[PDB]
Amino acid sequence: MTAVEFIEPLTHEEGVSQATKLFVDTYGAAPEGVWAAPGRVNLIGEHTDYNAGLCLPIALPHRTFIALKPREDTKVRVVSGVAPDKVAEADLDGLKARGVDGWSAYPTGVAWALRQAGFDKVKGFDAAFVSCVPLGSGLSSSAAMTCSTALALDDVYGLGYGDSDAGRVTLINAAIKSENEMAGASTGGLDQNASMRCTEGHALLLDCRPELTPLENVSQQEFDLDKYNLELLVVDTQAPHQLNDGQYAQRRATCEEAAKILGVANLRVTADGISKADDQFQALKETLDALPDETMKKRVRHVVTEIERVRSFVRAFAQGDIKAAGRLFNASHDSLAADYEVTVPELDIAVDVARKNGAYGARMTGGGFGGSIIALVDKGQGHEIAQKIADRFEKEGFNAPRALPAFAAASASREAKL
Ligand SMILES: OC[C@H]1O[C@H](O)[C@H](O)[C@@H](O)[C@H]1O
Ligand SMILES: [Cl-]
């Protein structure tokens, strides 16, 4: 039985080359250019983004590439390099929310979102996608697809939102709106902020209070693994997970009803009230006594402690306290498992193997219910822990996992013009 596979990121050259070839093969004409948005890892601050909390993503070197040409009419053609025979075709003229299904919903929905926002310059396009953000990995293949399309449409229609950070929040809202209202997949804003606003060697300290301007809601935190002789191990469990199954939405609804019983606009209000209390334990106790439901107490107890763990992680990493940073990873997972109840055996067992084989800490990243774990480990130990996870997986009768190199990489950009 064969060694655990590592999924190497497509280079600049491979992405441009493969995106354009799929373009020419499907459409015949050359694209106007090639754009790209990365997948992401969320280091800590999970199930916080839709509660107006704190998140800390990095962008992966792993990118979705779009070759795009705008069209004179309102028709949209899209093709994906995982099925280069199925061209999906749709029409923007009079298009309604939910008006496209399948994966074509996501990129079509981006033009739909921009025309809904009053960008009357935006008509149709042909696009070809090639990605190495693994599907079902919970590393935001979704956001990589929408944010690449949103940057391409901004560029070819000359909207003027692509060449600034502040500008991209308008493209981000469009990408978010495509996923929520066209693809009908509930999403909270973490993935698309990461994909369009992270920078190399930095994590994005994202504040999700919706009243904040773009300059107020991000801080670039130094995240140089080489400084501390670290490696970030990422292992996609490949556990089975129905893409959009209602679990994520139930969570959001419980939180939204938490906030209503509590009489706050959102749980970040509640979390900030507890944090600044002398006796945080007494502050959380008085909060949970207001929620009569056992499960709702646990969801709120997760969101309150998780926001504080983001502030605690940002301090720990800047101090070079990698033991303390690892413990914060461990506490975030443990909270996701017990209090939020979004883990599965594959995630728990992968984490336990990492823990018992010298990881500073390990945790599920993104939504849960499957997908990927992340581990702060010593440089040169990633392969060994990945292979230990794979061996356990086979002993368990689980599907084989796969691992990804990971480090803080660049956000969305244009890769090619002519
Ligand atoms: O941290 C939980 C996470 O789950 C998914 O990846 C969502 O799309 C994100 O917006 C975020 O809510
Ligand atoms: Cl096909």
Here the tokens at position 392 are: 């356990």
Q: What is the 83 CA–ligand 2 centroid distance (Å)?
A: 4
Between CA 164 and CA 214 the distance in angstroms is: 10
Between CA 354 and CA 373 the distance in angstroms is: 9
Which candidate, 33, 28, 35, 16, places its Cα nearest to that of 70?
33
Q: Is the CB of 188 under 6 A from ligand 1?
A: yes
What 388-394 contacts at long range (C-beta under 8 Å, 24+ apart), as own/partner pairs, is 388/353, 388/357, 389/4, 389/235, 389/349, 389/350, 389/353, 389/354, 390/3, 390/4, 392/349, 392/350, 392/353, 393/237, 393/346, 393/349, 393/350, 394/1
Q: Is the CB of 306 under 6 A from ligand 1?
A: no
Here the tokens at position 290 are: 């207001």
Nearest C-alpha to atom 10 of ligand 1 is from which residue?
188
Chain position carrying tokens 């300059």: 215
Alpha helix segments (H runs only) across 178-279 = 190-197, 247-262, 267-275
372 CB-near residues (< 8 Å, 6+ apart): 41, 137, 138, 139, 234, 235, 236, 237, 364, 365, 366, 404
The upper half-sphere exposure of residue 88, i.e. CA atoms within 13 Å in the direction of its Cβ, equals: 19
Residue 399: other Cβ atoms inside 10 A = 13
Handedness of CA 224, 225, 226, 232 (dihedral sign): negative
Helix (H, G, I), strand (E, B) or coil at 277: coil
Here the tokens at position 342 are: 């979004």
Binding residues: 40, 46-47, 49, 80, 136, 138, 140-142, 179, 187-189, 191, 248
Which candidate, 310, 254, 410, 411, places its Cα nearest to that of 42?
310
Between CA 271 and CA 264 the distance in angstroms is: 11
Any idea what DSSP says for residue 344? -
What H or E segment, with its residue span, contains residue 127? strand 125-131
Across-strand partners of 5?
402
Here the tokens at position 227 are: 């400084």
Whether residue 340 contacts residue 298, with contact meaning beta carbons closer than 8 Å, is answered with yes
What H or E segment, with its residue span, contains residue 38? strand 33-42
Here the tokens at position 367 are: 């939504």
Rounded CA Rg of the chain: 21
Experimental approach: X-ray
Q: What is the 356 CA–ligand 1 centroid distance (Å)?
A: 28
Whether residue 53 contacts residue 208, with contact meaning beta carbons closer than 8 Å, is answered with yes
- What would the DSSP string read from start to end of 148-193? HHHHHHHHHTT-S-TTSHHHHHHHHHHHHHIIIIIS-----SHHHH
Between CA 327 and CA 152 the distance in angstroms is: 40
What H or E segment, with its residue span, contains residue 206? strand 202-207
Amino acid at 390: A
Handedness of CA 174, 180, 185, 191 (dihedral sign): positive
Residue intervals of the chain classified under CATH 3.30.70.890 are 223-407
- Reported residue count of the chain is 418
Binding residues for beta-D-galactose: 47, 49, 187-189, 191, 248
Which candidate, 228, 230, 146, places its Cα nearest to that of 189?
146
Between CA 326 and CA 349 the distance in angstroms is: 17
- First-to-last alpha carbon distance for the chain, in angstroms, is 45
Any idea what DSSP says for residue 114? H
* 151 backbone dihedrals φ, ψ, rounded to 5°: -75, -40
- Considering the segment(s) 223-407 as one domain, its CATH architecture is 2-Layer Sandwich (3.30)
Between CA 88 and CA 109 the distance in angstroms is: 13
Between CA 203 and CA 221 the distance in angstroms is: 5
Q: What is the 188 CA–ligand 1 centroid distance (Å)?
A: 6
Pocket test for ligand 1, best of 187, 267, 307 (most atoms within 8 A of CB): 187
Any idea what DSSP says for residue 98? T
Which candidate, 74, 153, 72, places its Cα nearest to that of 106?
153
Whether residue 273 contacts residue 321, with contact meaning beta carbons closer than 8 Å, is answered with no
Q: Are strands 5-6 and 402-404 parallel, antiparallel or unpaired?
A: parallel
279 CB-near residues (< 8 Å, 6+ apart): none
* 75 backbone dihedrals φ, ψ, rounded to 5°: -80, 145
Burial class of 185 by CB neighbour count within 10 A (0 to 12, 13 to 18, 19+): middle
* 104 backbone dihedrals φ, ψ, rounded to 5°: -65, -20
